[PDB]
């Protein structure tokens, strides 16, 4: 209906509660392995944020996997920063991590993060 | 870190993509039964919105159930309106459904919805 009312803070409150579930390891259903590092997460949040995870978890065989191994060229800290962004909307972008974050966002198909990284790099040149 | 940047639309874009997954029945992991009606959903979204579902899916036995039967006094249309609110932030509140929506929100422990229902009822008296 076009007669709905909307609770402004709802989407951010949902995301905050999803991140609290992740911190407590509640209903996490996949482990993402990035070289020597493992990250537990919820497949639906990964799919909702990342074009790569959407393609992975909509595949009829990969949707059932409990472990996903990323390309060995992916930096674990870059992945950690992007996973935190997925669950919080906040990106810890710094001079020391921007190239790793941008490369990881290109691989994960997260265009808005790729865009802000390109803008910060261009401003320094 | 306190040096993060934030993407304003991220939380609403995540919620919009979760609702698209629900519409396509992608990675839904529970059926909620309300009398003769069945609703497929994602346990994590239900937990992130509802105090009742949080208690249910954090229980060591109930967390494993693929079907949850609600109290027979719960109205299916009221539940449908609240499930849509969980996935969209939009509440289809109307004169003809407000009492059912309020009773369902009290049962699901969704205090913000209970609050706006109380305010709309008080304004009509």
């Amino acid at each position: 209906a076009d007669s709905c009312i909307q609770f402004t803070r709802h989407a951010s409150d949902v995301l905050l509660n999803l991140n609290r579930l992740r911190s407590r390891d509640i209903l996490t259903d996949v482990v993402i392995v990035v070289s020597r590092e493992q990250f537990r997460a919820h497949k639906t949040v990964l799919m909702a944020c990342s074009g790569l995870f959407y393609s992975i978890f909509t595949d009829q065989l990969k949707c059932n996997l409990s472990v996903i191994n990323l390309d060995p060229e992916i930096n674990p800290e870059g992945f950690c920063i992007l996973l935190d962004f997925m669950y919080t909307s906040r990106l810890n972008l710094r001079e020391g991590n921007i190239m790793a974050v941008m490369a990881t966002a290109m691989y994960l198909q997260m265009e808005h993060v790729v865009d802000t990284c390109r803008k910060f790099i261009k401003a320094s040149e | 870190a306190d040096s993060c940047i934030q993407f304003t639309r991220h939380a609403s874009d995540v919620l919009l993509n979760l609702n698209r997954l629900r519409s396509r029945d992608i990675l839904t992991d529970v059926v909620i039964v309300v009398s003769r009606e069945q609703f497929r959903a994602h346990k994590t979204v239900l937990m992130a919105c509802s105090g009742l579902f949080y208690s249910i899916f954090t229980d060591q036995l109930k967390c494993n159930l693929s079907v949850i039967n609600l109290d027979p006094e719960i109205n299916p249309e009221g539940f449908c309106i609240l499930l849509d609110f969980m996935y969209t932030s939009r509440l289809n509140l109307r004169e003809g459904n407000i009492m059912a929506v309020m009773a369902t929100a009290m049962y699901l422990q969704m205090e913000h919805v209970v609050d706006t229902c109380r305010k709309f009822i008080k304004a009509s008296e």
Partner: peptide
């Protein structure tokens, strides 16, 4: 909060 979207 609540608003008219």
């Amino acid at each position: 909060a609540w608003v008219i979207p």
